[PDB]
Design a protein around this nucleic acid. Structure first.
Ligand SMILES: [K+]
Ligand SMILES: [K+]
Ligand SMILES: [K+]
Ligand SMILES: [K+]
Ligand SMILES: [K+]
Ligand SMILES: [K+]
Ligand SMILES: [K+]
Ligand SMILES: [K+]
Ligand SMILES: [K+]
Ligand SMILES: [K+]
Ligand SMILES: [K+]
Ligand SMILES: [K+]
Ligand SMILES: [K+]
Ligand SMILES: [K+]
Ligand SMILES: [K+]
Ligand SMILES: [K+]
Ligand SMILES: [K+]
Ligand SMILES: [K+]
Ligand SMILES: [K+]
Ligand SMILES: [K+]
Ligand SMILES: [K+]
Ligand SMILES: [K+]
Ligand SMILES: [K+]
Ligand SMILES: [K+]
Ligand SMILES: [K+]
Ligand SMILES: [K+]
Ligand SMILES: [K+]
Ligand SMILES: [Mg+2]
Ligand SMILES: [Mg+2]
Ligand SMILES: [Mg+2]
Ligand SMILES: [Mg+2]
Ligand SMILES: [Mg+2]
Ligand SMILES: [Mg+2]
Ligand SMILES: [Mg+2]
Ligand SMILES: [Mg+2]
Ligand SMILES: [Mg+2]
Ligand SMILES: [Mg+2]
Ligand SMILES: [Mg+2]
Ligand SMILES: [Mg+2]
Ligand SMILES: [Mg+2]
Ligand SMILES: [Mg+2]
Ligand SMILES: [Mg+2]
Ligand SMILES: [Mg+2]
Ligand SMILES: [Mg+2]
Ligand SMILES: [Mg+2]
Ligand SMILES: [Mg+2]
Ligand SMILES: [Mg+2]
Ligand SMILES: [Mg+2]
Ligand SMILES: [Mg+2]
Ligand SMILES: [Mg+2]
Ligand SMILES: [Mg+2]
Ligand SMILES: [Mg+2]
Ligand SMILES: [Mg+2]
Lengths: 167, 69, 77, 168, 260
RNA sequence: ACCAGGUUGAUUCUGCCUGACGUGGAUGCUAGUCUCAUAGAUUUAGCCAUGCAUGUGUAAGCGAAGCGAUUAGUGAAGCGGCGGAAGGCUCAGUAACGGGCGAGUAUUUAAUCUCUAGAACCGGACAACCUCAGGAAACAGAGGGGAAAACGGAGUAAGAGCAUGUGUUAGCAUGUGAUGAGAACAACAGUGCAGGAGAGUAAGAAGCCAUCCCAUCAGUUAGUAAGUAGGGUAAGGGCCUAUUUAGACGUAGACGGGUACGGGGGAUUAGGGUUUGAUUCCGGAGAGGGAGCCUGAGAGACGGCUACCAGGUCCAAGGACAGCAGCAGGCGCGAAAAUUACCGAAGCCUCCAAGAGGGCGGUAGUGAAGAGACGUGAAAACAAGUGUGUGUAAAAACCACAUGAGUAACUGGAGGUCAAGGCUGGUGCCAGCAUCCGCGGUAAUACCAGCUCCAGGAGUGUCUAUGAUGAUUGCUGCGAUUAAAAGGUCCGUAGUCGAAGAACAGUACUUGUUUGUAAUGUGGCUUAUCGAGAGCCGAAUAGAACGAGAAGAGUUCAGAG
RNA sequence: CGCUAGUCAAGAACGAAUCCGAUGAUCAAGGACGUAGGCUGGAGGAUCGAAGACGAUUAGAGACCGUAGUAGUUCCAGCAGUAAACGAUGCCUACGCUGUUGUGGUUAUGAGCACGGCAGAAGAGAAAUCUAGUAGGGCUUUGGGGAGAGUACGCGCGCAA
RNA sequence: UGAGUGCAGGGUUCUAGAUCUGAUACAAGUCGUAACAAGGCAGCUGUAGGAGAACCUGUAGCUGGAUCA
């Protein structure tokens, strides 16, 4: 099937090269995993040396870290807002590293409200949390690790990404 | 046999022509120059006969051996 | 950027040399951005592959020399 | 075909050169050798030692000169070929003796062969019947028979050579 | 090749084993284990050649099926097990003991010892690491590993091991005036004393040596094992104590110096 | 470290033809003995009848039928375990990670070593067994029991990734968590199996440098050159994809086409060279041609599977099987290459083994490819035969003693080069000979024969490639007024080449130390009757690491011109 | 390149205490000139004369000789690219014997510098002869026994040749 | 991911072909005699016409000329 060898590739001078071997398994590739939002479905792949890799086909939830206050929570994921590589993955709601996603904010709202300086430190986050908006970014690789995990956007990261969403 | 060309060859010995019939098989050999070149006084001939019907022509002519029959 | 390196090859039969050269494509970082330009000499270190052709990074430079913008005497002497 | 084993003869460049023919004919005749191959074999042996002497005399370094001179001279003394009073630990005499090797001749190797030794020690009436006693097992050295006429006799074996009467 | 190599042609095997070229096409492929393949020898070559006690494969089997041979204090039952340098070999019946060393030529050789020398070996320190549960460890040239040794032992030192307890006993470092033994190079099997060390960065250190009968020779640290606390050696070396002579010297010593 | 014959009525030159000598194949005639090597590579990586080349069991995983027993036992059908990815064969394809030298990562690794290291319950089936019973065969059905250290579930240790502290970086702390197991048995006194961390072996990907011919092939490339982000993989990377930037490579030969397994090495050789390398060692690729793949630690495997194309085999016509660039063997093709042989022994590899397997490997048979030593008489007195013993896995040969005896040369030549007859008889520009020069028209030392000589000799002639001859390819080292040979004249880019004086710097340059060579080759010594042969020793090329010297080369200056 | 005046640019050599300071040698590709004969357009047309036509001479002359006669031969604007385009001797730069004769400058009037001719010598060379002596100075072109052949196919220039 | 196979083209190497046109060898055939002697018009190089055929004629050049004058 799919290959990772440079058999077929041109030389740096623009010339073609001839083929000297049939394909080998030790440079095999595999088709993409397109992790969709939905009820959990994960497949186990037998990999080189007899190791196992975990491939997420559908995911419902993620662990999300708050970096300033040092806690982590488990929450549902609604939809993708932005994707840096391709506009298509947004409209079809596919999960990858570096995708920006909407989540249930209520658990974070309950925790952050405890800090008496919270409103003064980050007014734009505070406003978003009132309006029922809560935004995070995915750091894990779902097609490799079999799950999604990330952190809550705060401070200048909000100011940067919110300008990508707006029409 | 190997090329399907037809060529001229020389028959070396005193009564040599009498040892050969039409439709015999012969093995043929070079005259010994650097390129293929004519030797002595024979114009335009470039090979010579060596064996007739699997046996040495020298032996046939000098009556040391006989035709396979 | 493209770096050229030059050397001599000995041809045993004629007991003489020929000049040869090779081209290497190297990574230049923004910290050197204004300082390095065509004709300068550069030192590069080896790394794992960065792309199809690229394996070295510029680590420093030696600026093509001027001894002095020569002195002009005063008209008074 | 390329295969194990050395080749021990060199064919002369001119097959019918009259001065070479005459001088070879004489030496085969006198010494009772089988054919020209016996002679040419001895000639190659002789040339090899002459080459070593040449190389030693022209060498630049001292370590090789002092080491390999001794070995060459001792070997040729043991065969009974180079008979002179070489003194070791004396650079000049080593050089002198190396120069004396450079005009060594094949006659000296021939006279160490068993066929000639037997006749020369007066154990046979001719160089021919000497060969005929080496065949047919009549010749014995250190109590053991030697079947081969080309056996080269080292210096001091001469005490132990003997002949016995025929089997009939 | 589709997978791992099993055979070994006779012309390809290490020159240190010293096996005759003409007899057969194969040689024994050492099992995986303590030393590298280039720095060790399989046990069946020892019993048939270096120390003759078998003459045929049927006999080599029988000796080990009966469980006779002990290496570093454990009984061995793999005929292709690798033995390396400074490596005590023993038969408990008849109480024999041997170390494995190099000839001056660099071949392998067994040397008979007393039951005192049989109690310890020497190795070189390669890495230091801390492991899960905050446990310090140290490792050595022949795949050895040690827990809770003295923390001061430094990479590159050489250590003496008690074979019965499997603990470190003594430590010595690479300094001027200590005894050294030569594992690889032009001067394998030589023994000498350190004149001077020249430190290099990101590259091997160069060590200069004086021989017991006067000769200077230098080599890189990667080929030297340090074999004494200061002055004089731990292990007992061969019948000839590691002096190598040129053919030139052998001649001078045989026929006398060249006189004026 | 070398020459000879041949243009003229003679001469001196240019110049090429031919002889004389190594080596790889083919072939004519002849052949006594013993020893060491080697054989379908060249043409068709053409086609294949037959037989063999891969299997393994203990005291110690599970054990059905049968036999048998005061509730014992046995002896094992299948299951499980470990191997079948090595070795053997060939050179089609490939101008390239194909080759040499360094380095150890961005990676994965069953076995094996050192340290360490394990409290777990429950359930069905599959194969064999038993009763029916299909099919031309190859190959399969129903129904019912029953095991495991085989398999699936439960709890439970453990635990990937993510985030923040702290120690590069292990480790530790804290929050969050997908996942989620595990073998004992025998006592002849041991053998196994779960987890970690480090080694050891093997791959994958990388750095530097070297690599054939055609200009009657001058422009080539658009995943092409790069960047940002993501997917994929054991892993870096246009490896693949989305949007941005236009790059990359060429007369110091790009691109296209033709050709090629690459080295260690071989042949010739005073020196400088010229030619070759299928072929004992290393690395690569393939299994009729292409393409996909399951299992596994590891295959894009072909003495595994699947489909097409080209060919075949058996049938009861419905279907089945199969791939000798393994070992023997057959047919073709060619000018071209051995036995359908023995093997509980030697060297090694494989298993659950005080044992089983191996056409891998060894032993002989066959053949004037190559290389040693000796016979064919002596002057008194000579191989090869035979019988015993040895020898071996069993043999034969070899060697020892003892018996008979009296056998044993041909190939090419004899005018010059070029060693050796104007001998006798035939033939008359015929028939033939002759590498070259030339012989023969009735007085032929050259044809055809007789007889004497010469040369090498168990060997000698011929054909064909190549090295030498050859200073006729010229770096060392040829020529260009008239022999073959200076562009009709200028300008000019790439290219090759470039003052004196005073100073300066170290990358070339040269050299030290250390690495870098099994075989072959080189310098030696020791044992087979001798000599090749065998065994042990010493030094070594190119290439790389670190120092040193500064004449030549290089860079700069101006009270120098 | 050969009559006389006037006019317009640049060059070579010589004399000498001028200025700048390595700016230089040779040259694939690329560019400019090139007798004669030929070709495209204009002007012109005395003499000479390919082709063509006659008269003689000869076996025959189609030729040589004589009569006649056209394109060309001259000029302006271009194309073309060959010669026994030869001293059959590449370009820079050296080291080198004597006598004699020129041309142009300068001169202590003794001589020099640039460009030549001639006659010996010594070396050289197969000789004839000497642009050819001595020599690992630099760079480009170029030959490798006669023939076939400077011919075939492809390609580039040209209106064609 | 792709074997196979349709239909157009190219790139290479071979081979057929009525007829035309080169070269080489032709014991000695036919017609002349162009070159080598001042070879019977001194020869040769470029270019342009013409002609059974060697060759002949105009124009510029060369001596390797029959002249170092
Ligand atoms: K003549
Ligand atoms: K022969
Ligand atoms: K071939
Ligand atoms: K049927
Ligand atoms: K097969
Ligand atoms: K076969
Ligand atoms: K043959
Ligand atoms: K034998
Ligand atoms: K004869
Ligand atoms: K005769
Ligand atoms: K006669
Ligand atoms: K030639
Ligand atoms: K030359
Ligand atoms: K020209
Ligand atoms: K000047
Ligand atoms: K003109
Ligand atoms: K006319
Ligand atoms: K007329
Ligand atoms: K006329
Ligand atoms: K007129
Ligand atoms: K022009
Ligand atoms: K022009
Ligand atoms: K010309
Ligand atoms: K002039
Ligand atoms: K000349
Ligand atoms: K043409
Ligand atoms: K004429
Ligand atoms: Mg590969
Ligand atoms: Mg073969
Ligand atoms: Mg293999
Ligand atoms: Mg074979
Ligand atoms: Mg090929
Ligand atoms: Mg379980
Ligand atoms: Mg794209
Ligand atoms: Mg090869
Ligand atoms: Mg394969
Ligand atoms: Mg396959
Ligand atoms: Mg196979
Ligand atoms: Mg075999
Ligand atoms: Mg004679
Ligand atoms: Mg003759
Ligand atoms: Mg010549
Ligand atoms: Mg001429
Ligand atoms: Mg000429
Ligand atoms: Mg010319
Ligand atoms: Mg011997
Ligand atoms: Mg200088
Ligand atoms: Mg001027
Ligand atoms: Mg005109
Ligand atoms: Mg020129
Ligand atoms: Mg020619
Ligand atoms: Mg005439
Ligand atoms: Mg005339």
């Amino acid at each position: 099937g799919i290959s990772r060898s440079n058999r077929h590739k041109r030389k740096e001078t623009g010339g073609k090269k001839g083929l000297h071997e049939k394909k080998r398994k030790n440079n095999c590739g595999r088709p993409p995993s397109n992790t969709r939002i939905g009820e959990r479905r994960v497949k186990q792949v037998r990999v080189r040396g007899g190791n196992i890799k975990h491939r997420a086909l559908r995911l419902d939830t993620g662990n999300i870290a708050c970096k300033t206050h040092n806690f982590t929570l488990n929450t549902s994921i609604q939809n993708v807002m932005y994707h840096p590589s391709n506009n298509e993955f947004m409209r079809t709601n596919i999960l990858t590293k570096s995708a920006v996603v909407k989540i249930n904010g209520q658990p974070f709202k309950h925790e952050l409200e405890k800090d008496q300086q919270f409103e003064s430190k980050d007014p734009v986050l505070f406003d978003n949390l009132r309006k029922g908006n809560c935004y995070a970014i995915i750091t894990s690789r779902p097609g490799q690790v079999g799950m999604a995990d990330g952190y809550l956007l705060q401070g200048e990261e909000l100011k940067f990404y919110m300008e990508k969403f707006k029409k | 046999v190997r090329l399907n060309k037809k060529v001229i060859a020389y028959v070396p010995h005193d009564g040599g022509l009498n040892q050969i019939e039409i439709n015999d098989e012969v093995i043929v050999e070079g005259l010994g120059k650097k390129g293929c070149r004519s030797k002595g006084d024979i114009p335009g001939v470039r090979f010579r006969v060596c064996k007739v019907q699997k046996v040495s022509l020298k032996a046939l002519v000098t009556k040391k051996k006989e035709r396979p029959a | 950027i493209v770096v050229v390196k030059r050397y001599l090859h000995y041809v045993k039969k004629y007991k003489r040399y020929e000049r040869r050269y090779k081209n290497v494509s190297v990574h230049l970082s923004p910290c050197f951005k204004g300082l390095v330009n065509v004709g300068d000499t550069v030192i590069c270190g080896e790394t794992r592959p960065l792309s199809k052709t690229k394996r070295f990074v510029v680590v420093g430079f030696e600026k093509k020399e001027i001894k002095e913008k020569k002195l002009k005497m005063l008209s008074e002497i | 075909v390329k295969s194990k084993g050395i080749k021990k003869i060199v064919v002369p460049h001119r097959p019918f050169e009259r001065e070479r023919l005459v001088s070879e004919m004489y030496i085969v005749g006198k010494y009772g050798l089988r054919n020209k191959r016996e002679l040419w074999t001895i000639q190659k042996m002789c040339d090899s030692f002459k080459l070593r002497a040449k190389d030693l005399l022209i060498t630049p370094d001292e370590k090789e000169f002092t080491l390999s001179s001794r070995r060459l001279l001792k070997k040729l003394a043991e065969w009974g070929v180079f008979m002179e009073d070489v003194d070791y630990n004396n650079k000049q005499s080593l050089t002198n003796n190396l120069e004396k090797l450079l005009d060594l001749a094949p006659t000296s190797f021939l006279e160490r062969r068993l066929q000639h030794r037997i006749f020369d020690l007066g154990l046979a009436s001719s160089v021919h019947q000497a060969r005929a006693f080496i065949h047919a097992r009549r010749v014995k050295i250190n109590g053991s028979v030697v079947n081969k006429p080309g056996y080269l006799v080292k210096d001091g074996e001469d005490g132990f050579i003997e002949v016995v009467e025929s089997k009939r | 090749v589709r997978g791992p190599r099993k055979h070994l042609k006779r012309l390809n095997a290490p020159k240190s084993w010293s096996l005759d070229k003409n007899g057969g096409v194969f040689a024994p492929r050492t099992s995986t284990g303590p030393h590298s393949m280039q720095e060790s020898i399989p046990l069946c070559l020892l019993l048939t050649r270096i120390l003759k006690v078998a003459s045929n494969n049927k006999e080599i089997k029988h000796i080990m099926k009966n469980r006779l041979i002990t290496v570093n204090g454990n009984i061995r039952t793999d005929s292709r097990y690798p033995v390396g340098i400074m490596d005590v070999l023993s038969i408990k019946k008849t109480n024999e003991h041997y170390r494995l060393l190099y000839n001056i030529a660099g071949k392998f050789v067994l040397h008979k010892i007393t039951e005192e020398e049989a109690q310890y070996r020497i190795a070189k320190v390669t890495n230091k690491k801390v492991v899960k549960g905050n446990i310090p460890h140290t490792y050595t040239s022949c795949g050895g590993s040690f827990k809770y040794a003295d923390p001061s032992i430094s990479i590159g030192d050489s250590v003496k091991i008690d074979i019965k307890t499997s603990k470190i006993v003594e430590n010595s470092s690479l300094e001027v005036g200590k005894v050294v033994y030569l594992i690889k190079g032009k001067n394998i099997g030589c023994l000498g004393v350190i004149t001077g060390i020249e430190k290099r960065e990101g590259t091997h250190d160069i060590v200069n040596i004086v021989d017991k009968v006067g000769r200077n020779f230098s080599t890189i640290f990667s080929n030297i094992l340090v074999v004494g606390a200061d002055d004089n050696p731990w292990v007992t070396f061969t019948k000839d104590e590691g002096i190598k002579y040129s053919e030139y010297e052998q001649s001078i010593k045989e026929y006398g110096p060249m006189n004026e």
